[PDB]
Amino acid sequence: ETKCTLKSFTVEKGIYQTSNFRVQPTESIVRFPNITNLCPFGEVFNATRFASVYAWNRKRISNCVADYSVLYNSASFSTFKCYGVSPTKLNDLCFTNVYADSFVIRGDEVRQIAPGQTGKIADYNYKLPDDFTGCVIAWNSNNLDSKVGGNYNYLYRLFRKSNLKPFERDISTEIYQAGSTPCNGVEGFNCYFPLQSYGFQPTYGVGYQPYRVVVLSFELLHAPATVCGPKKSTNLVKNKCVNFNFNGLTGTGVLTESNKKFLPFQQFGRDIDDTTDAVRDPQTLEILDITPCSFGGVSVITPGTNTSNQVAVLYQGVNCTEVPVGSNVFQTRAGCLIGAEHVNNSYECDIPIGAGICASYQTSQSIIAYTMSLGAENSVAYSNNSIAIPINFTISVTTEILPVSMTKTSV
Amino acid sequence: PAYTNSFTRGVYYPDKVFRSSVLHSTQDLFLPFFSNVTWFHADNPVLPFNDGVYFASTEKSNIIRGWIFGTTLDSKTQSLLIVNNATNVVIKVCEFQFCNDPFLFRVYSSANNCTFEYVSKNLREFVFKNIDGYFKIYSKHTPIDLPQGFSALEPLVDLPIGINITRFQTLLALAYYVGYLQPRTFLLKYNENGTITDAVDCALDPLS
Amino acid sequence: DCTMYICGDSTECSNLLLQYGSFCTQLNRALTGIAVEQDKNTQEVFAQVKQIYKTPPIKDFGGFNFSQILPDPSKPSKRSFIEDLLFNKVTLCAQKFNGLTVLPPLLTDEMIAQYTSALLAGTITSGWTFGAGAALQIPFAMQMAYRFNGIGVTQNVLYENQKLIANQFNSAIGKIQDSLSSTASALGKLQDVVNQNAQALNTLVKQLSSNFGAISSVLNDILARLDKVEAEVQIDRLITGRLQSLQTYVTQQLIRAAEIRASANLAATKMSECVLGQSKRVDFCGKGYHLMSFPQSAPHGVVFLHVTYIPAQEKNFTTA
Amino acid sequence: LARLDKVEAEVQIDRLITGRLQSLQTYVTQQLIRAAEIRASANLAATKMSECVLGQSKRVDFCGKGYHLMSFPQSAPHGVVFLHVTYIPAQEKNFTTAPAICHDGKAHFPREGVFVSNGTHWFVTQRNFYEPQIITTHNTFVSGNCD
Amino acid sequence: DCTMYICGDSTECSNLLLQYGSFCTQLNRALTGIAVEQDKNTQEVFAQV
Ligand SMILES: *[C@@H]1O[C@H](CO[C@@H]2O[C@@H](C)[C@@H](O)[C@@H](O)[C@@H]2O)[C@@H](O[C@@H]2O[C@H](CO)[C@@H](O)[C@H](O)[C@H]2NC(C)=O)[C@H](O)[C@H]1NC(C)=O
Ligand SMILES: *[C@@H]1O[C@H](CO)[C@@H](O[C@@H]2O[C@H](CO)[C@@H](O)[C@H](O)[C@H]2NC(C)=O)[C@H](O)[C@H]1NC(C)=O
Ligand SMILES: *[C@@H]1O[C@H](CO)[C@@H](O[C@@H]2O[C@H](CO)[C@@H](O)[C@H](O)[C@H]2NC(C)=O)[C@H](O)[C@H]1NC(C)=O
Ligand SMILES: *[C@@H]1O[C@H](CO)[C@@H](O[C@@H]2O[C@H](CO)[C@@H](O)[C@H](O)[C@H]2NC(C)=O)[C@H](O)[C@H]1NC(C)=O
Ligand SMILES: *[C@@H]1O[C@H](CO)[C@@H](O[C@@H]2O[C@H](CO)[C@@H](O)[C@H](O)[C@H]2NC(C)=O)[C@H](O)[C@H]1NC(C)=O
Ligand SMILES: *[C@@H]1O[C@H](CO)[C@@H](O[C@@H]2O[C@H](CO)[C@@H](O)[C@H](O)[C@H]2NC(C)=O)[C@H](O)[C@H]1NC(C)=O
Ligand SMILES: *[C@@H]1O[C@H](CO)[C@@H](O[C@@H]2O[C@H](CO)[C@@H](O)[C@H](O)[C@H]2NC(C)=O)[C@H](O)[C@H]1NC(C)=O
Ligand SMILES: *[C@@H]1O[C@H](CO)[C@@H](O[C@@H]2O[C@H](CO)[C@@H](O)[C@H](O)[C@H]2NC(C)=O)[C@H](O)[C@H]1NC(C)=O
Ligand SMILES: *[C@@H]1O[C@H](CO)[C@@H](O)[C@H](O)[C@H]1NC(C)=O
Ligand SMILES: *[C@@H]1O[C@H](CO)[C@@H](O)[C@H](O)[C@H]1NC(C)=O
Ligand SMILES: *[C@@H]1O[C@H](CO)[C@@H](O)[C@H](O)[C@H]1NC(C)=O
Ligand SMILES: *[C@@H]1O[C@H](CO)[C@@H](O)[C@H](O)[C@H]1NC(C)=O
Ligand SMILES: *[C@@H]1O[C@H](CO)[C@@H](O)[C@H](O)[C@H]1NC(C)=O
Ligand SMILES: [Zn+2]
């Protein structure tokens, strides 16, 4: 691994960080609320009479267990777009609350039911937000919403003073004024009734045919969940490193019993730096600390390859109870040191490891690890009347090497 | 009506997330520090709701019992009725034809098209918010004019109702203060027990 | 850990990060150079002494009292009294999801305290001669008399006023002890380095909360909510922003490391020129004419107690 | 460019441009930092040339260990090597010493050097080399009485 | 002024800039350290007397 990370077949004496250690999770935990009540999608999709798009209906779906596969697996839907959510993962995800909206529109108007759209329907009938989190489901209804001589049950707003806000509704029938001529509450030049009815004859082209639409809006929030997918909740285990999924809160960690005094309304707890740090189990209501599964740089300690192929491994900051492991083990303050042999002697620091520990290849040779010596101890023999004077002298020549320049380069 | 200084009253837990031994800057509708709140004596006049309301009562006989919220405050629109009866807190949403002078039962002449219901010396503080299709209530009871001091209101209940509110009125059984929330950045201090013990209204003054 | 700061536990993100190539190798390599250099900086300042010189048990230093600066055997770290004050006055394994880890220094605080004790013991028992190499013992009052010659005062001034000079020195050390106990801003030069590094890490960690245009700042949300083709578009925004955030941190740490490197070279120069010798350089070793200096270790720093001769009670004379 | 038309190629090229530009900025930034390290080492080498080669330096450990005598510069690839020549005391010997000599009530101090006793006879000698001399009225100075 | 260099008078741009988080605080803080240091540099040279 050192040879590979250095991209060299030979390695000089030293300590080289080659990779990173990580305690992999033992198993996966899933914990959703123990709600058996199936969500009532049937009454929004199979209603006899839908709402006029100018007066689009809304229904809250909550405190129930959903199964969006029943919807998405059906072949009858002509369009099943989703924004900020994927139709497959939608069944694994969980939400606080959901709003189901429904109305009838022309086939040519389905393209307006998307975030950021404009036009008569988008601007004056049903406006989606810029950051819409839901799914738009639509199907042709020329078998139900049209008849010979035309069906005029449905209406849409043709004129308005200003564009609607997202999810805003306006059922007013005040005659719109398109010019300086006052209308005084009656139609005429520049004076038109704000609503109009579709020409739903059954012989019309697909763009003119009626289409039923259901829009599902998902409230992803920090608030407690009430609409989860059909996933079966697993048993709960502690102190093991495990994957977890609490009401959608997904991660990996060491679930530990928490002494943190969560108030009865609180569902999650957070780190000083706003990361999720504790959670309430949705069934037992116990509070669990989420400690991260331990990690650390893996440093390989080696003499030069021209000296020996034997090496030691330092798991930086890792405790020796956590590592999986050529079998000497020594808990330095720098981390768990493996493959090096601890000795009580002290020597000059050959290879530095940290916290006063160094390593060297020494005798039967092995990689020893020792507390480094600062130097030889020496009592100066000081006294109030003794002086030492050199009888002789040594003329010494010392090389000092200093960098002065570097290779002039241009790109 | 009279007027009084709110001091540091009206802080509440902005989110249902436990935080402890940390200072967290949050931006939400809060009652500004030292705000000039309206004062009434028991008075049951109709008042605007604006962006949100802070309501507090100093009492010794539990005379104040509920509130009504809406726009027309009549059967032409849905309205929210909150009433603390002698045995249960009761909450209802209906097109209530509220009386000209509601009191405790003579709150409305008739009701129809109901769509939501829920049933559960003293300074009582309450905060009412109506944002993103939720009506949210926070409250605290404190043993004791509005006293200067600091305590945080915990969430009492919230209603997933989409109704429109612009004005409200108080229901009495045969003194209180009203303040209005504003979008303010508050630096909140959480102790080791995870309760808010101090706050700084960042827009109040240069030191803040 | 560049790959853990940017992607955490996600293999999906880790594979996208490979498209940026060498950036995580460069970041880890740059931080490693900074870390290795911190041990060099400490070795260059403190490991100047060849041998661990020990003070005599009988401290007959001509009346000069070094008890506040020599090691206290009762302390577990064997620090001096002033060194213990310095360590107490500066006030600030891996269990962080963000991959941040703090490496221990090579020399422990106990080893650094052992080097300063050797430097100090050598200075008082042998003067400047331990720097040149032989560590020739000399009575303290006599080496102080040579310090006087070095500042251009005749050596008889030391012996004739030795009691006064010793009393003045002992009192001045007492004032330092009282000062470091009572003051706060004196160590602000070391505390600033701690505050700068802490603030830089809090900045780096808080940047994980930013969206950088993604639907969510939490990368596990995107993978739990969007399929591969859509998730990768959102993750690429987090990767780009987090990578830029980490590059900004590493760049500014390289600049700070160069500031500390300069301060360490300076501290190493003062050790050699002020502690191992007597310096003729004006204001290099405190105000006044330099006599000697005593090194004291501090958290991530060194304190030099510069002893100097300051003229006083000047009187007018006619001259020719 | 060989595989995509302008409208699609420009979208793909803008990614390479953004990444390559950031890659080159990272190199230039770190070279500026390294250049500052070399600049400091060059200023130091220039200081040692002036103070160690063109002079004799009293600065301890500036020009090698021991007392500096002289230095010789030698060029190296992108660097300079200083051969620092220094005097190092050797074979130190213990002597009894005194700060002053009392004579006829006068206190005598060494002009330069230190008083040392071979065990029976007092001598004055230079501090850095044992060369003992008779204590005389010339190599010592008087100041005050012996008390 | 990091927010004015990047966005000028635009509130629409200013809200987008918030998505990048701390970068404008870091830039202003770095330049402030440089500016404060210029007074230190002058004091260190001239205020010696
Ligand atoms: C200097 O001498 C001391 C010992 O003092 C001795 O007694 C004196 C009265 C005088 O006669 C000296 O010259 C004598 O040598 C030496 O210190 C001892 O050294 C040995 C090792 O050689 C060691 O085991 C002892 O512990 C030392 N004692 C102390 C108190 O440290 C010292 O080495 C002599 N120095 C030189 C340069 O010769
Ligand atoms: C490494 O981790 C283990 C736990 O896995 C620690 O062992 C515990 O140590 C405490 C004393 O500190 C004992 O009371 C426990 O009984 C030990 N537990 C076990 C299972 O042995 C160990 O101390 C850690 N080592 C370091 C250096 O932190
Ligand atoms: C001073 O030191 C030198 C060594 O640097 C000594 O010279 C040696 O002396 C011995 C005889 O005692 C000879 O055998 C060696 O060949 C000499 N070496 C050299 C390099 O000349 C010298 O004796 C010492 N002088 C004193 C007075 O101790
Ligand atoms: C809630 O209902 C009230 C009506 O009771 C709305 O108030 C009107 O708003 C329009 C602008 O949209 C004004 O032109 C009218 O003058 C307002 N009427 C009154 C009596 O104030 C209010 O807009 C509605 N709020 C929402 C969010 O739909
Ligand atoms: C307060 O209101 C609650 C309703 O919210 C009343 O409770 C009902 O009381 C009747 C008997 O009078 C029972 O048949 C119902 O089952 C109760 N409903 C619930 C939900 O508990 C209560 O009686 C009222 N109290 C007073 C004093 O009027
Ligand atoms: C309850 O609300 C509905 C509207 O949702 C009212 O129904 C309307 O009643 C008027 C007559 O008053 C009719 O002209 C409308 O056609 C009705 N609309 C619908 C959709 O049916 C109903 O009257 C309300 N009931 C009460 C008691 O107020
Ligand atoms: C050296 O200095 C220390 C102070 O740092 C002196 O210790 C004090 O001595 C007095 C008695 O003279 C005690 O009452 C104090 O409690 C001591 N203080 C400490 C901190 O120990 C010591 O006496 C001085 N020694 C000499 C020879 O002057
Ligand atoms: C101390 O120094 C004196 C000189 O001042 C030495 O005395 C001489 O010793 C030699 C024999 O070694 C005689 O030949 C001389 O005549 C002596 N001179 C005088 C003036 O007496 C003495 O030997 C030295 N002692 C030691 C122990 O070195
Ligand atoms: C609507 O009814 C059909 C049967 O007529 C049923 O298969 C379908 O599931 C119903 N819709 C929903 C959303 O369940
Ligand atoms: C869910 O399960 C727990 C047991 O783990 C049980 O105590 C609780 O009552 C269940 N939920 C409901 C709503 O009953
Ligand atoms: C390897 O070591 C041998 C001595 O054992 C030496 O002769 C040889 O030059 C070395 N080669 C390299 C590439 O270091
Ligand atoms: C090393 O020293 C420790 C005490 O620090 C002792 O417990 C241990 O037995 C010693 N081991 C050897 C091999 O001497
Ligand atoms: C509070 O506001 C009213 C106006 O609504 C004003 O008349 C009154 O003087 C104010 N009181 C204080 C103390 O500011
Ligand atoms: Zn003369």
Author numbering:
A (entry chain C): 298 to 622, 639 to 676, 689 to 736
B (entry chain A): 26 to 67, 80 to 141, 157 to 172, 187 to 210, 215 to 244, 264 to 297
C (entry chain A): 737 to 828, 851 to 1078
D (entry chain C): 981 to 1127
E (entry chain B): 737 to 785
Sentences from the paper on this structure:
S glycoprotein trimers protrude out from the viral membrane and are the major proteins on the viral surface, making it the main target for vaccine design.
Our quantitative Cα RMSD analysis identifies particularly large structural differences between Alpha and B.1. The major differences are around the A570D mutation, in the 630 loop (residues 617–644), and in the FPPR (residues 823–853). The closed form of Alpha has important structural differences to the closed form of B.1. First, residues 852–855 (chain B) which form the end of the final α-helix in the FPPR, instead adopt a β-strand conformation, folding down and packing against residues 858–861 (β-strand). The Alpha variant has an aspartate to histidine mutation at residue 1118 (D1118H). In summary, the H1118 mutation (Alpha) permits a stabilizing interaction (i.e., ion coordination) in the closed conformation that the D1118 (B.1) cannot make.
